[PDB]
Amino acid sequence: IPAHRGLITDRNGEPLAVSTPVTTLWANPKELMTAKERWPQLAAALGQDTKLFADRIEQNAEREFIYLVRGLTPEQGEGVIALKVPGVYSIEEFRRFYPAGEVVAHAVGFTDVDDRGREGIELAFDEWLAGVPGAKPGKTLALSIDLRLQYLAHRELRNALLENGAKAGSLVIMDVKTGEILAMTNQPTYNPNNRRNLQPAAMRNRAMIDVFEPGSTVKPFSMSAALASGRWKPSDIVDVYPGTLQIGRYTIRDVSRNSRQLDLTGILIKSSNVGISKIAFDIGAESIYSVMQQVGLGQDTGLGFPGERVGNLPNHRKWPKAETATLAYGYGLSVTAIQLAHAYAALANDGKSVPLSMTRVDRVPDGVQVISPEVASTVQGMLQQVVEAQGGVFRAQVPGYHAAGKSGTARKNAYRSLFAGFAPATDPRIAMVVVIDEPSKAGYFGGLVSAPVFSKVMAGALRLMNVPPDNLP
């Protein structure tokens, strides 16, 4: 006797996964064998072919139990029952219905033929949701996801993917104060109510299971290590001329090569690999690795989603010069979009990392101070200048608010366009990561492709959360 599976809701109680009654029909072939004249009407009502159905019953004539069909609607099930065929019996089972469909398909996940979790929350909280067959019903679960922010993020990421002719994308929104995942969307997506088709690529929760090189989006962590060392201040200068730096057989290169002296904010604005590498040589890679490890890059999230990827943060006992530079500019590191969002949330939350949660958090757990508050506050200010200053990532500006962030562009020529940031700068509330895989139009830089999505989504999410606009006199 299958048990009723627990309702999944969003954080405000909107239904996301609902157990729906279905009819399963079984037969005692010993009794069905006494009513062969009824078989063709029964075959037609079950959908099945006349002769194939007849062959099936004859083959199981000595059995006392066989399944005829599973998961009919309790309309077609009543239609088979109205035939009054001897030996035909019914069992009430459950099939999930997902009211928001493709919009939250990767996060909510789905169930297999036996109504057991196969992907996402359905799989991760299967014990909680499943209950026990007879029969004790499963328990309700409220997610951290806010369906209003989810609809917005879904729409904007889909629109950006079409405008850039991209292969795939992910967008995660986090509450920096509580560790809650407020939205998590990917493209391509699928309709979890359509149990035919089922494209494995479209079902991938990319924000959690796909690893990527974060590139320039890790530079704020390298800078946090520089400021915490006691050796660097934002007004310090680094000479990046002539825009390249030879380290043995390896050549570090900047995209814009018309700089000489840059201050630390300028290094982030211009996204100078040479500048961040020179700072890394001075402070040592051990300090940078420790910040990136502590914010969770390439570390287990603790979420318990089977198949979730940990990625990799390279480590050494003695760091060679090339690896010191590449670590500092995010080359050769492998992270997930959830990890990158969580790292930006700790930075935004004055350096305190609050544990990640996919469920609504009522009592917030204690956070861990990973970056000193003063250092996190200084880096936040630099990231606000990255968005607001002359020559900055102007497309990440959020009209009405002070926003902060960092763009990234990774050469996989195929590219991945990134933007990670938070808002409002006066008292950060939300961190967001936008990852667009293989944009195919003229623009591929993170500040061109991903920054406008951050702006559109952040503009709506702050307003949906009634956050007061902070760009005031």
Ligand SMILES: *C(=O)[C@@H](NC(=O)/C(=N\OC(C)(C)C(=O)O)c1csc(N)n1)[C@@H]1N=C(C(=O)O)C(=C)CS1
């Ligand atoms: C940060 O992401 C920087 N990106 C890189 O240096 C990488 N590649 O640079 C390009 C120009 C795309 C290349 O083809 O080599 C890179 C880092 S990890 C990886 N696999 N590739 C800088 N980021 C930006 C930005 O803000 O988006 C720039 C405009 C200058 S390069």
